[PDB]
Curated annotation (Swiss-Prot), chain B:
The chain holds residues 30 to 269 of 629 of the full protein. It comes from Pseudomonas aeruginosa (strain ATCC 15692 / DSM 22644 / CIP 104116 / JCM 14847 / LMG 12228 / 1C / PRS 101 / PAO1). This is Methyl-accepting chemotaxis protein PctA. It is found in: Cell inner membrane. The ligand binding region binds directly to 17 L-amino acids. L-methionine binds at residues 92, 97-99, 115-118, 144. PctA has a broad ligand range and responds to most of the proteinogenic amino acids, whereas PctB and PctC have a much narrower range and show strong ligand preference for L-glutamine and gamma-aminobutyrate, respectively. These receptors are paralogs: pctA gene duplication in the common ancestor of the genus Pseudomonas led to pctC, whereas pctB originated through another, independent pctA duplication. Residues 3-240 are periplasmic. The lineage of its organism: Bacteria, Pseudomonadati, Pseudomonadota, Gammaproteobacteria, Pseudomonadales. The gene is pctA. Chemotactic-signal transducers respond to changes in the concentration of attractants and repellents in the environment, transduce a signal from the outside to the inside of the cell, and facilitate sensory adaptation through the variation of the level of methylation. Major receptor that responds to all naturally occurring L-amino acids, except L-Gln and L-Asp. Also involved in repellent responses to trichloroethylene (TCE), chloroform and methylthiocyanate. Also mediates chemotaxis to histamine, but does not bind histamine. Belongs to the methyl-accepting chemotaxis (MCP) protein family. Residues 7-230 form the Cache domain. Signal peptide: none annotated. L-isoleucine binds at residues 92, 97-99, 115-118, 144.
C-alpha cells in the first residue's frame, strides 16, 4: 500500500510527461505555422504551407480560419453548408487565450465525431488575422495514455473541473466525475481515492500534465483495488 | 530456497525495469520527434522561398528561438545564416560540419552524435534536414540541442532512487550521461571487465564500488541513428 503508491505516482509521473511531450511537438508545429502566416498569409503560401508533410502527417487536418471568415484546410474535405470558422470552439478558445490553447473535445463540424484541436491566433501589428488549428483524434490519445498495462487498470484524461476529456470507455467521454462516481465523488487533488465503478472497487490517482498551454488537465489512473492488492 | 527466491525478485525487477525503459524510451522519442519535425517544417518552408529577408525572419520566429540554442541555414554555396546571432570563427564553412554532412548522407532529417561546436568549442547535438526544391538540395537546416537538456528529459523520473538513465549508440558510444566524464566514452572504457552488451537487454556490471544492473531499450523513430536508452540500477538497493 506504500510501495504501491510509490509506483502508481511514478507511472503518472512519466506517463504524464509522455503525453506532455507527444503534445509539445504538435503545439510547436501549430505555433510555427501561425508565426509564418503572420508574415505571409497569401492564399498560395497558405496552401503550400498546410500541404507540408510535417503538418499532414501530424494532425487529421490543419487549417487557417481568417478574421473575414475565409477558410483553408488540408487535406481536402467535403464542407458543410453555412460553415464559419469564427463561430467554432478552436477559434473562440484561441482568441480568448491570446495564444496557444487546446480545446476540450467538441463535435467536428464535418464528421460530427468528437475531436480536440490545438490552435493559436495569427497576429500582426496588433491585428488578429485569423486562427490556425490542428486536429488530433481522441482515440489516438487514449492509445498514448493506455500504452502500459501491470494489468490492474486503465488511464484517462480529465479537466481540473471534472469533465472527462479522453477515455478508453467510449461512453465516459465528456461526462463529469459526479456522473460516473456520484457517491464518494473523487476529489481531483493530490493523493489517492477509492470508488466503485460497475460494482467493483477501484483506486483513482491524478497527476498534473505539465506544459499544456491555457488549460489544466490531469492524467487519471484507475485501478481495481482487489486485483492490485493481490 | 535462495535460488528460487532470488529468481522471482530478479524477474519481478526485470519486469519493472522493462516497463520503465519502454515509457522513458517513448518520452525521449517524442521529445526528439518534435524538434526533428520543426526543422523539417523550417526546411520545407525555406524550399519555397529562401531570400535573405525570409530566411532572417523565419529563423527569428519564437517557436525556433525558444526550442533551439541556434537555428541556421547552410547553403550549397557555403553561405550561412544563424539566429540568434553569434560571433563567428574564421574559416567557417557550413558544408564541412557534422550536421551538414550527416543530413546530406541521410537524405532527410537526422540527428548528430555530440560534436564540438565551431563557436563555443563545446559538445552539442544538432537536428538537421536537407532543404530540397525540385529534386535539388539547396542546403541544410540545423537546430542545436544542449546535452544537459537531453539528460534532463530522460531522467525526469528517479526510478525509486534506484538509479539513472543515459543514451548510448548501437556501437556502444555513451552519447548523453549525468556524469560529464562519461560522455563520448565507450561501454568498453567505462566497464572494461564485464562490458555490458546491448543486445542482451539485462547486464550486471561494476562501477564506483557497486554492482549495477544495466538495461537497454531501442529508441524508435530517430532517422539514421541507432540509439538506446540505458538504465543503470544499483542492484543491492533494487533487490532490497
Ligand atoms: C472541420 C474542422 C473541425 O475540426 C471544425 O469544426 C473546424 O475544422
Ligand atoms: C554553429 C553550428 C554548430 O552547431 C557548429 O558547430 C557548426 O554549425
Amino acid at each position: 500500500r506504500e510501495d504501491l503508491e510509490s509506483y502508481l505516482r511514478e507511472m503518472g509521473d512519466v506517463t504524464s510527461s509522455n503525453i506532455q511531450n507527444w503534445l509539445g511537438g504538435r503545439l510547436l508545429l501549430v505555433e510555427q505555422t501561425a508565426q509564418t502566416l503572420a508574415r505571409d498569409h497569401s492564399p498560395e503560401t497558405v496552401s503550400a504551407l498546410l500541404e507540408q508533410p510535417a503538418l499532414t502527417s501530424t494532425f487529421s487536418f490543419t487549417y487557417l480560419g481568417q478574421q473575414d471568415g475565409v477558410f483553408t484546410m488540408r487535406p481536402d474535405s467535403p464542407m458543410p453548408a453555412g460553415y464559419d470558422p469564427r463561430s467554432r470552439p478552436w477559434y473562440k478558445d484561441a482568441v480568448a487565450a491570446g495564444g496557444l490553447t487546446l480545446t476540450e473535445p467538441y463535435v467536428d463540424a464535418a464528421t460530427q465525431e468528437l475531436i480536440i484541436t490545438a490552435a493559436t491566433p495569427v497576429k500582426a501589428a496588433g491585428n488578429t488575422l485569423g486562427v490556425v488549428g490542428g486536429d488530433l483524434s481522441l482515440k489516438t490519445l487514449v492509445q498514448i495514455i493506455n500504452s502500459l498495462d501491470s494489468g490492474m487498470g486503465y488511464a484517462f484524461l480529465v479537466s481540473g473541473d471534472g469533465k472527462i476529456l479522453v477515455h478508453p470507455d467510449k461512453e465516459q467521454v465528456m461526462k463529469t466525475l459526479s456522473e460516473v462516481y456520484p457517491q464518494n465523488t473523487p476529489k481531483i487533488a493530490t493523493g489517492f481515492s477509492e470508488a466503485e465503478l460497475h460494482g467493483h472497487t477501484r483506486i483513482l490517482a491524478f497527476t498534473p500534465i505539465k506544459g499544456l498551454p491555457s488549460v489544466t488537465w490531469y492524467l487519471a489512473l484507475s485501478i481495481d483495488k482487489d486485483k492490485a492488492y493481490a
